[PDB]
């Protein structure tokens, strides 16, 4: 778009429309773009430091940042989410509106104390989005540099920096490296807006809802089964202990050993650790008990991990180490924070499906039984996909990622993004935007030396993302009611998902979507 | 092809994550070894430990053996050390077996 | 409404004013805490309002003169409703609408 110095670009688009089965959000966010590495690319290594062969990288930061807005509480306030998680079993991304407007570029000169900062009419910040999937995605890993969760909050964008192939420090022939100059990119005046349209693949509605049953109670309680299994092996109403082969039908009073249809979910056991700092080891187990992968003779933990449930019926305490998202509230740290700084999640309503994450899987026959041999058992810790089984994936959060890219790969199995949210073959693309560099004044003879001095200057604009989403209808003949999300009638000195008296927003708690019930 | 990155190299090193992990169970700063709970949240100086989407793929892991004769062991293991399946009473090595990378 | 004039179910709406916040300068390493720190401004401009009023007129048919809202012919340092030499207005009384009369 063409618009004098005097003249927006765009308006403020804020809003929240429903129709139907369908829930359209607008939000409007305003941004601060600096100049990041003093328009370079670094090479950046863990070279030095001595970090663990775990944590050694190489790669680049980038004179670009980008836009993030792969977390709900971008898109959704919290009474609209209340309004999703009370009364829909599902939803899904559909199409995607984004629009860049407004921008200022601001000269910066700083003259002993005092700093001025200024207009400069004249500087573009260029906007591009890689809609092609050329550059490493680095979306969807749980960054910050979102937007905001409160509208009226000025946020800070984020740096674009991405990874490739690292031997140790050291990089290796096919290493990556990415010049961000290369893709044509739109170039903006504070006259200029820009604009682009997205649509989302088909993908599944996600589960905004819990099972009223479980695995192992779907059959008739008052109805014997036709099938028999294998009881004793030792004969009942025998003086002695003398082998037997008795057989019985499948009945209401043993659930137990009924023949049933279906598997639980796969399973790879976490380590239990209570909340009650006395209950456990005295010892930092975090790593060294942690379950972890093993890739090119590097460990990395596993979190979240396979979808399980987070503690079983009345173990509230619990909560797998490293198999539950958590949260930090606004005030915690950046290490070694309180547990009551931060806010775990409780993925507990999918024990109806899914192993309790802290627990074996089952017990397996290790042996052959005879009458020398006493049979045995051991326990299941790591259960791969067997035919049978179903499952619930791990649920998603207001404060959660919504999406994420699926890798490249020839193969995967059931791709839904670990942390929660829609795996995408193509998600929405990065939109990276850099502030153009504005040279300052070159010597009078000619120097081809590179150019290293700048008039220091940063740029604002506002931003604006639409989202459709469909919504899934709740269908429910359940008679009673249904648990759902809501704020505490009662009195208290702060009112939930709001400002304090210093002007900060906070969010109390995270809020899943799993309210609604169904059959299974 | 191959792929120019790994996947526990995906993430931005420049940025922290908004995740939290429980970083220790054991106090940092305590004259004794004291219990706590200490969460520490994703960063680019412990790539090791942040939350991530994804796992590699899966395994059925096999003898390593060197090329160079005198690394390995006295014995004839092709068959005893052998990763094998087993149907209907009969032993069939897996060759070659899924697909894993062959040295680090 | 208990302070005079009308009640209205959709009155005329709240218009609400505000300035665009304009960060200044970020830092060059980057911070997702939230900023604070703006170039100081303030906006003016020119606001219009026309209202359309309906009038009831007066039909009277009283022979003597009614009551009339009147400025005082006689002498005064200062007009009614008015600049002082200072240059402030200042509204003297409180002028109602009761002036003119009907039966009962
Ligand atoms: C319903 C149930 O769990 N039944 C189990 C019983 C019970 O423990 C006893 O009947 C206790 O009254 O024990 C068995 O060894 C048996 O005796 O056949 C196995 C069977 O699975
Ligand atoms: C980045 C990394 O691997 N951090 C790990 C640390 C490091 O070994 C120490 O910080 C060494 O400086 O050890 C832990 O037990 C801890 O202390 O929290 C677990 C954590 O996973
Ligand atoms: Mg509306």
């Not at 349209?197 to 996600?206: K, N």
Request: aromatic share 12%.
């Amino acid at each position: 778009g063409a618009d004098g110095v005097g003249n927006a670009s765009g308006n403020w688009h804020c809003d929240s429309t429903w129709l139907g089965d369908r829930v359209i959000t607008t939000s409007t966010r305003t941004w601060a773009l600096p100049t990041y590495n003093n328009h370079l690319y670094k090479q950046i290594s863990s070279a030095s430091t001595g970090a663990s062969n775990d944590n050694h990288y190489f790669g680049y930061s980038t004179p670009w940042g980008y836009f993030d807005f792969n977390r709900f509480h971008c898109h959704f306030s919290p009474r609209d989410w209340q309004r999703l998680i009370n009364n829909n079993w599902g939803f899904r991304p559909k199409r995607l509106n984004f629009k860049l407007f407004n921008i200022q570029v601001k000269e910066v000169t700083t003259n002993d104390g005092v700093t001025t900062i200024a207009n400069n009419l004249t500087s573009t910040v260029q906007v591009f989005s890689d809609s092609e999937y050329q550059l490493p995605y680095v979306l969807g890993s749980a960054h910050q540099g979102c937007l905001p969760p409160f509208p009226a909050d000025v946020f800070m964008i984020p740096q674009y920096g991405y990874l490739t192939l690292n031997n140790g420090s050291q990089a290796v022939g096919r290493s990556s490296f990415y010049c961000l100059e290369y893709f044509p990119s739109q170039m903006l005046r504070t006259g200029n807006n820009f604009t682009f349209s997205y649509t989302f693949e088909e993908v599944p509605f996600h589960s905004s809802y819990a099972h009223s049953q479980s695995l192992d109670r779907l059959m008739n309680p008052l109805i014997d089964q036709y099938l028999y299994y294998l009881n004793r092996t030792q004969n009942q109403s025998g003086s002695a202990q003398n082998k037997d082969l008795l057989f019985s039908r499948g009945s209401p009073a043993g659930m137990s050993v009924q023949p049933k249809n279906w598997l639980p979910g796969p399973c790879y056991r976490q380590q239990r650790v209570s909340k009650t700092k006395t209950d456990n080891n005295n010892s930092n187990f975090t790593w060294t008990g942690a379950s972890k992968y093993n890739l090119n003779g590097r460990e990395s933990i596993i979190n979240p991990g396979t979808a399980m449930a987070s503690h079983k019926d009345d173990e509230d305490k619990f909560f797998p180490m490293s198999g539950v998202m958590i949260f930090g509230k606004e005030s915690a740290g950046a290490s070694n924070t309180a547990l009551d700084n931060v806010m775990i999640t409780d993925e507990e309503e999918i024990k109806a499906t899914n192993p309790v994450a802290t627990e074996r899987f089952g017990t397996v026959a290790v042996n052959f039984q005879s009458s020398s041999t006493d049979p045995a058992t051991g326990d299941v810790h790591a259960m791969g996909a067997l035919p049978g089984m179903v499952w619930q994936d791990r649920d998603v959060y207001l404060q959660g990622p919504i999406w994420a890219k699926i890798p490249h790969t020839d193969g995967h199995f059931h791709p839904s993004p670990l942390m929660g949210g829609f795996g995408l073959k193509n998600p929405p693309p990065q939109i990276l935007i850099k502030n153009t560099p504005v040279p300052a004044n070159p010597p009078a003879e000619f120097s081809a030396t590179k150019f290293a001095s700048f008039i220091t200057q940063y740029s604002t604009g506002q931003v604006s993302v639409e989202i459709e989403w469909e919504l899934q209808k709740e269908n429910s003949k359940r008679w009673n009611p249904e648990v759902q999300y809501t704020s505490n009638y009662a009195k208290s000195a702060n009112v939930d998902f709001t400002v304090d008296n210093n002007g900060l927003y906070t969010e109390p708690r995270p809020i899943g979507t799993r309210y609604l019930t169904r059959p299974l």
